[PDB]
């Protein structure tokens, strides 16, 4: 139909936009965030991608949870992703923030961010490399180019 | 005279009603006093174009160099009774009475 | 046709500030040892398309404690403003010949200062406050400078006219002339576009992207476009006042073709200080142009108004 | 001679922006006193024309007042010219 | 390398480079094939409306010479 | 007529950019969300309460060098006058007038932030 | 006649209302740079352009030190607006129904205040016919101000010098 | 053993004073930092192409 093929080319492009323009929010937590910088160093240019890093949440696509999310802190990181306006998305990379890690039977550790925020990718590894990283950041991506708003609102 | 004349006084007179009635901070009685000075500004080279009057055409900047004299006094009080006081308000300057 | 004309000026503008984000990443990439935007298209040519689609797809929020007039006033006076000050460049013919066309930019330009003010006080958050007060201070040294500055370099000049400062220029160049000048003014454009070192009202290390912190989706993009349109002027303008190219009536495109790769050359130079360079505290800004540029900029005033008058080289009125 | 020496020594070596703004604004002060050009910058600036030359009308008694403006009677702006 | 930022800048030069040609096109499309007349003082305001009184069609750039005097 | 003409596209320009904004997307808008930004936790303050200005004198003497400057401004018309001399006694006075008035604030520690 | 110079007198008036009512130094400032603006293309239509600008950028400038001035001592809680406050809301009611009451008795007759006798009549008619020819007047009569004028320059130069003193003594304190 | 990482005071000469004045008036440092950034703008990046390169591992 028509009004299909229109709504299934508008949806493409706007899916595109939202793939190739991704803003972190510049948020690490503890170990995990060396590897987010190597992966910003020129060695594996997250930049290239269309990744950068912005400081405020406002301005922010992605947050990628990397590292130890304690009680103390959930309610901060609660606060900075809902002020992320939507579409908003999160990654969570390592053990520490998958599930809980090396401090899995701790006191003060909580047993995964996807408790907190709603998780989209879940990247393994203490610290997972670079590499696994961007290869979390493409399957990020693959995943958002399957999505179909417009595609789902027609047929509404 | 005609209607622009007119308008020019008459936000003149509203500048200078708006400085006699207080209301509760100073800064806003300096806005008011800076918005007379402007008023006049317009007013005097209104006047002063129309009559091609050309030696007179340098007044209307005497006239802005003095107004930004008063309003740097201005400010310099104005921090003076914040810093005694806390507060700009108009109702803190009763020391003295009449 | 003027609605053509200024079609022909606005649109171009925007594409041209679009491709200098992108330019702006790709020099500091390869500055940083890295490559910059590679992947979108064709050596990254859509990525300013894929940012800017996603930005006006993206939601935009008015905070709680916003003053939501003001709030949407800041950027469409920061974008405004940001396009209204190329109407009266000469490219070789302005859009907008105007006999004081100087006095214009400058008053332009302070009417600018206010938008990152009003949103930063608008948000209504500490950071935002933080970064306005930080445009006030700076904007204070940098507009009294500037001022003097521009006064000695019309002065060599004769008027306020930049078709007559193309005449001027006809022979040899205003940063022969006056490099010190030059280099002053350098300097307080710097300043007066919120570039490296003295990028302090969105300094991202000390404050959350600063005055711009509650902006978001459409919002921001307007403060960014607004800001680079500002870097592509006072950069045109520069290249106008002190590196003056030779106008031939009959084909003028040879004029635009150096007025063009001047201009490109100095925004490259803003990329490459950028990438350079530490930032400054903003007291030691104020303190670097009152103690060192100011002094300076007074006795330069005194040469230049002297210049002419003990050379018998005054220029003609008109 | 000795201590102002020293006092343009320690100035040119903690404050160099002062010693060369005080020394531009005394240059500026001084030299057009001394120039020679001053006066032909005045008189460049009245010989140029912004207003209409108004006749005088002719009493016979008018030797310097040229007839016609090719006349050799009038200002002359041959000075100018090889300039 | 360093060349793979030329594509932008050459875009970037390509936009910029529209604003002054088409102001000069115009120029010239508008003013009958010559330059926009330049009107800073009355003198060249009452020159420009002479000229306009004068061509006999409304339009200063329609110039008239030895053939319309006589 | 042709500045009002661009100011007004300008303007139109603007306005309809952020209308396209606020309109286009999907809006989902909660307490949480719209909350103030402070790295994660809730101000304990307002954003309104007084802020301290350690630079107030330096903004007076701005105001000051700022009619200064607009006294010298008209000079490229006045250096085209008949006495050049008597401009170019004025214009130094006033110059000199301003370099003293910084050189008295810089002596007496005006440009000097608050402690 | 296009009644450009009447419709920016009326917004230099309606300005000046804001500005009055005073709801807090944000929004006084606010409507003292639109009144600058306006005032600036007022006088710019009158012939004045040096002047215009003049003024708008001393007030740009002035407006911005108010600016601080006003979110360092002059703030509150809950800043006033025009709405906020039945007293300011009053007041800019007052004015702006005063400044419409004397337009339309200007538009519909020859309006004679109490004060002076206005015309309601051509803004162009008052215009003259005369011309001048390869300078502008106005920047003559202003650059007048040092050949012309020595006794005002110096005057304003001690003025000038004698506020930063002054200044600077109110504030010392002690 | 140890040594101090800024204990020299400059010397006092007519010439090393000018040098330090042309150094102030004459941003000779910044320009020195200008000339570094461009040598590593003309200087080969140091990325690779992934995930169609990878970058090198150990058993
Ligand atoms: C050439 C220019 C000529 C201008 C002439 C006129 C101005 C003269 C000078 C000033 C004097 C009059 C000022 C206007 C008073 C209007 C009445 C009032 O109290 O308004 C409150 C309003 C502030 O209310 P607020 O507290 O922010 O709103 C929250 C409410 O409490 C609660 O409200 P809410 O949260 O429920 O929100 C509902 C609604 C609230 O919307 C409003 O209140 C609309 C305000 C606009 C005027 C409406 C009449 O929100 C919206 O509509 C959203 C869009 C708002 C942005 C668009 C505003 C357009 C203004 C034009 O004041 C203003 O809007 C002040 C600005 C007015 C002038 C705008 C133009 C500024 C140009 C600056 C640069 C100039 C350069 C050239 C020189
Ligand atoms: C949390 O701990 C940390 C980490 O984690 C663990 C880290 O990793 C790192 C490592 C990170 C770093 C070292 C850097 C990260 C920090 C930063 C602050 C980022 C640094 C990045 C840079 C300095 C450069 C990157 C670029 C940036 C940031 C700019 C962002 C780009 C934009 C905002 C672009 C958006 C704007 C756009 C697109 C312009 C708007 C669009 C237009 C104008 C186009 C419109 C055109 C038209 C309308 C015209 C259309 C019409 C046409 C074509 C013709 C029509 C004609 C007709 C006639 C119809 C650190 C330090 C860290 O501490
Ligand atoms: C107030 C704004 C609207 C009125 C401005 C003035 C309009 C009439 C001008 C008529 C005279 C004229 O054309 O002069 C030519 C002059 C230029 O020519 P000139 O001065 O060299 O001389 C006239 C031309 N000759 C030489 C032939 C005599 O125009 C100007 O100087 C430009 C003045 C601009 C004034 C701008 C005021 C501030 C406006 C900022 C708006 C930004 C957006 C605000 C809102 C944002 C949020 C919604
Ligand atoms: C105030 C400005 C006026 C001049 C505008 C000049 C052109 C503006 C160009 C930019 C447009 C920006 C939006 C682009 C499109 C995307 C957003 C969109 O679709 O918004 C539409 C909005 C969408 O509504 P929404 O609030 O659900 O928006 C969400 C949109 N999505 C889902 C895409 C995120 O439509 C409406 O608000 C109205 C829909 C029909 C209901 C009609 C109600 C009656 C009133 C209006 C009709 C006329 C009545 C006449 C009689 C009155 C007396 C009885
Ligand atoms: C900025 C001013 C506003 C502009 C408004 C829009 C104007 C048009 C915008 C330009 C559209 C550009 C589309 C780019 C096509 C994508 C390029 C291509 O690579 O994408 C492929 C296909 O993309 C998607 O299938 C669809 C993309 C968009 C297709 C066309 C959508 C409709 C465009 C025409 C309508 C525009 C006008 C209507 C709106 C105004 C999939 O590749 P991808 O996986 O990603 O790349 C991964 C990287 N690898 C390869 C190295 C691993
Ligand atoms: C004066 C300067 C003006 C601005 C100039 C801007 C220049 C921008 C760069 C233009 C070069 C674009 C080259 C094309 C890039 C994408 C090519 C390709 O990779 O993408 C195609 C996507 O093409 C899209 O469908 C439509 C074309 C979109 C790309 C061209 C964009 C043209 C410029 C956009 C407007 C620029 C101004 C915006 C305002 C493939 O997608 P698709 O076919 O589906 O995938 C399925 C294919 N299978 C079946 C084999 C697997
Ligand atoms: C010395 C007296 C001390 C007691 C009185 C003190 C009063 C205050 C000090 C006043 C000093 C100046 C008074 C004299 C003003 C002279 C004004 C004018 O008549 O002379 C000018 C001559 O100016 C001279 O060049 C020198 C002017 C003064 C130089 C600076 C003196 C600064 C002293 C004051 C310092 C500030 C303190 C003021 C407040 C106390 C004009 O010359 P001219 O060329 O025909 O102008 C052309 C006009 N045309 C076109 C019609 C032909
Ligand atoms: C038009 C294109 C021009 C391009 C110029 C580009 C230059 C390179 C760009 C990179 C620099 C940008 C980032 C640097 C910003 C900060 C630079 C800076 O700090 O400069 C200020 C610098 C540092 O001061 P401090 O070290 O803090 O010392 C203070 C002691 N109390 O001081 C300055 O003022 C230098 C400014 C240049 C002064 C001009 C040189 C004066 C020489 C005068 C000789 C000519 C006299 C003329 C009369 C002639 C008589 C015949
Ligand atoms: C017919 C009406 C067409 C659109 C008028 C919009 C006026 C309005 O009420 O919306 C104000 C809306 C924000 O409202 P929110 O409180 O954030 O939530 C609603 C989000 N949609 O503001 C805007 O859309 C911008 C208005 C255009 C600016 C014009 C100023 C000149
Ligand atoms: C009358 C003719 C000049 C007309 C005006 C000159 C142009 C404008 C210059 C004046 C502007 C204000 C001058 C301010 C001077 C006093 C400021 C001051 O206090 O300086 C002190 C005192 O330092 C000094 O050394 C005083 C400056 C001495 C300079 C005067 C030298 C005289 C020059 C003679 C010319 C010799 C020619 C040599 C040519 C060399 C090449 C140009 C140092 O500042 P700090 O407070 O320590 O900085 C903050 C640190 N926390
Ligand atoms: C040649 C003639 C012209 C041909 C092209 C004509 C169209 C051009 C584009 C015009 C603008 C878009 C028009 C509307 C598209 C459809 C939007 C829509 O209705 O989306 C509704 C839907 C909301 O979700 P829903 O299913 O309602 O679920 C409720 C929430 N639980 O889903 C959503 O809201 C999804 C979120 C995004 C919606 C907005 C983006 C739609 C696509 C816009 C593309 C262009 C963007 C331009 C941006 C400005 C310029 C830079
Ligand atoms: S998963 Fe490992 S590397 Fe990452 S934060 Fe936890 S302990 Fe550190």
């Given at each position: 139909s028509r009004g299909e093929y229109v709504v299934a080319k508008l949806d493409d492009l706007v899916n595109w936009a939202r793939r190739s323009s991704l803003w972190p929010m510049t948020f690490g937590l503890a170990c995990c965030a060396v590897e987010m910088m190597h992966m910003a160093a020129p060695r594996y240019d997250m930049d290239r991608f269309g990744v950068v890093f912005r400081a405020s949440p406002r301005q922010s696509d992605v947050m990628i949870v990397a590292g130890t999310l304690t009680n103390k802190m959930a309610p901060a990181l609660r606060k900075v992703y809902d002020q992320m306006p939507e579409p908003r998305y999160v990654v969570s990379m390592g053990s520490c923030a998958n599930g809980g890690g090396y401090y899995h039977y701790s006191y003060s550790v909580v047993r995964g961010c996807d408790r907190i925020v709603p998780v989209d990718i879940y990247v393994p590894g203490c610290p997972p490399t670079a590499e696994a990283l961007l290869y979390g950041i493409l399957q990020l991506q693959r995943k958002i180019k399957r999505e179909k708003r417009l595609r789902i609102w027609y047929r509404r | 005279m005609p209607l622009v004349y007119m308008n020019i006084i008459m936000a003149f007179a509203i500048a200078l009603a708006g400085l006699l009635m207080y209301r509760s901070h100073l800064m806003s009685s300096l806005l008011c006093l800076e918005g007379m000075m402007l008023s006049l500004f317009i007013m005097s080279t209104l006047i002063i174009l129309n009559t091609h009057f050309?030696?007179?055409?340098?007044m209307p900047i005497i006239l802005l160099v003095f107004a930004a004299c008063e309003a740097a006094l201005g400010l310099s009080l104005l921090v003076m009774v914040s810093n005694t006081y806390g507060t700009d308000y108009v109702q803190n300057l009763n020391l003295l009475q009449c | 046709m003027f609605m053509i004309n200024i079609l022909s000026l606005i649109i171009p503008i925007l594409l041209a500030v679009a491709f200098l984000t992108l330019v702006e990443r790709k020099v500091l990439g390869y500055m940083q040892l890295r490559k910059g935007p590679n992947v979108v298209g064709p050596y990254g040519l859509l990525q300013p398309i894929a940012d800017a689609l996603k930005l006006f797809t993206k939601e935009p929020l008015r905070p709680?404690?916003?003053?939501?007039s003001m709030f949407i006033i800041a950027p469409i006076l920061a974008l405004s403003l940001a396009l209204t000050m190329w109407v009266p460049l000469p490219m070789p013919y302005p859009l907008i010949n105007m006999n004081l066309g100087v006095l214009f930019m400058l008053a332009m330009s302070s009417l600018a200062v206010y938008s990152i003010l009003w949103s930063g006080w608008a948000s209504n958050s500490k950071y935002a406050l933080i970064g306005a007060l930080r445009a006030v201070a700076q904007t204070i040294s940098y507009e009294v400078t500037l001022a003097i500055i521009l006064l000695s370099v019309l002065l060599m000049n004769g008027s306020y006219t930049l078709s007559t400062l193309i005449t001027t220029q006809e022979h040899i160049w205003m940063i022969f002339t006056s490099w010190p000048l030059a280099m002053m003014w350098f300097i307080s454009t710097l300043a007066e576009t919120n570039?490296?070192?003295?990028?302090?009202?969105?300094?991202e290390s000390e404050l959350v992207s600063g005055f711009n912190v509650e902006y978001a989706a459409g919002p921001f993009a307007m403060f960014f476009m607004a800001e680079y349109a500002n870097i592509i002027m006072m950069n045109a303008f520069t290249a106008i006042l002190f590196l003056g190219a030779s106008h031939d009536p009959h084909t003028p495109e040879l004029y635009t073709i150096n007025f063009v790769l001047k201009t490109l050359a100095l925004t490259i130079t803003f990329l490459w200080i950028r990438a350079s360079y530490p930032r400054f505290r903003y007291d030691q800004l104020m303190h670097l142009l009152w103690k060192s540029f100011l002094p300076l900029t007074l006795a330069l005033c005194m040469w230049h108004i002297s210049l002419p008058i003990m050379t018998a080289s005054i220029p003609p009125q008109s | 001679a000795g201590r102002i020496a020293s006092f343009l020594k320690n100035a040119w070596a903690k404050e160099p922006v002062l010693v060369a703004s005080f020394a531009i604004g005394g240059l500026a002060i001084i030299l057009p006193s001394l120039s020679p050009y001053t006066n032909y910058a005045i008189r460049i600036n009245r010989a140029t024309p912004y207003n209409y030359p108004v006749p005088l009308r002719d009493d016979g008694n008018m030797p310097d007042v040229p007839s016609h403006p090719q006349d050799p009677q009038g200002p002359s702006l041959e000075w100018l010219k090889n300039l | 390398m360093w060349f793979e930022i030329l594509p932008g800048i050459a875009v970037m030069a390509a936009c910029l480079f529209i604003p002054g040609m088409a102001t000069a096109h115009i120029h010239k499309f508008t003013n009958g094939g010559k330059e926009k007349r330049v009107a800073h003082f009355s003198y060249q305001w009452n020159l420009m409306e002479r000229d306009r009184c004068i061509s006999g069609v409304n339009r200063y750039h329609v110039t008239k010479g030895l053939e319309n005097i006589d | 007529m042709n500045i009002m003409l661009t100011l007004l596209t300008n303007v139109t320009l603007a306005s309809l950019l952020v209308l396209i904004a606020f309109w286009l997307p999907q809006l989902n808008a909660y307490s949480e969300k719209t909350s103030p930004y402070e790295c994660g936790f809730d101000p304990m303050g307002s954003a309104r309460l007084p802020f301290s200005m350690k630079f107030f004198l330096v903004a007076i003497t701005f105001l000051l060098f700022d009619l200064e400057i607009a006294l010298l401004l008209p000079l490229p018309w006045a250096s085209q006058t008949n006495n050049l001399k008597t401009m170019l006694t004025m214009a130094l006075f006033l110059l000199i007038l301003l370099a003293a008035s910084l050189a008295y604030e810089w002596t007496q520690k005006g440009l000097e932030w608050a402690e | 006649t296009m009644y450009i110079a009447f419709i920016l007198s009326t917004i230099f008036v309606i300005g000046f209302v804001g500005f009055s009512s005073k709801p807090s130094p944000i929004y006084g400032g606010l409507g003292l740079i639109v009144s600058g603006g306006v005032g600036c293309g007022i006088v710019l239509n009158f012939g004045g352009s040096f002047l215009g600008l003049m003024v708008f950028l001393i007030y740009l400038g002035g407006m911005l030190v108010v600016f601080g001035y006003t979110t360092a001592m002059?703030?509150?809680?809950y800043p006033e607006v025009w709405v906020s406050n039945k007293t300011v809301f009053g007041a800019f009611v007052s004015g702006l129904m005063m400044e419409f009451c004397m337009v339309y008795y200007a538009l519909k007759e020859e309006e004679v205040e109490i004060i002076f006798k206005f015309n309601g009549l051509g803004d162009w008619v008052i215009y003259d016919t005369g011309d001048s020819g390869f300078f502008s007047e106005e920047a003559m009569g202003i650059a007048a101000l040092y050949s012309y004028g020595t006794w005002l320059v110096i005057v304003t130069g001690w003025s000038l010098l004698i506020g930063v003193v002054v200044i600077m003594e109110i504030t010392r304190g002690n | 053993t140890y040594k101090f990482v800024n204990m020299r005071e400059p010397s006092m000469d007519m010439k090393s004073v000018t040098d330090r004045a042309a150094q102030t008036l004459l941003w000779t440092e910044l320009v020195r930092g200008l000339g570094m950034t461009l040598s590593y703008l003309f200087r080969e990046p140091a990325t690779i192409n992934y995930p169609f390169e990878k970058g090198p591992l150990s058993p």
């Open positions: - | 050309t030696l007179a055409n340098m | 709680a404690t916003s003053s939501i570039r490296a070192p003295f990028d302090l009202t969105e300094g | - | - | - | 002059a703030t509150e809680m | -």
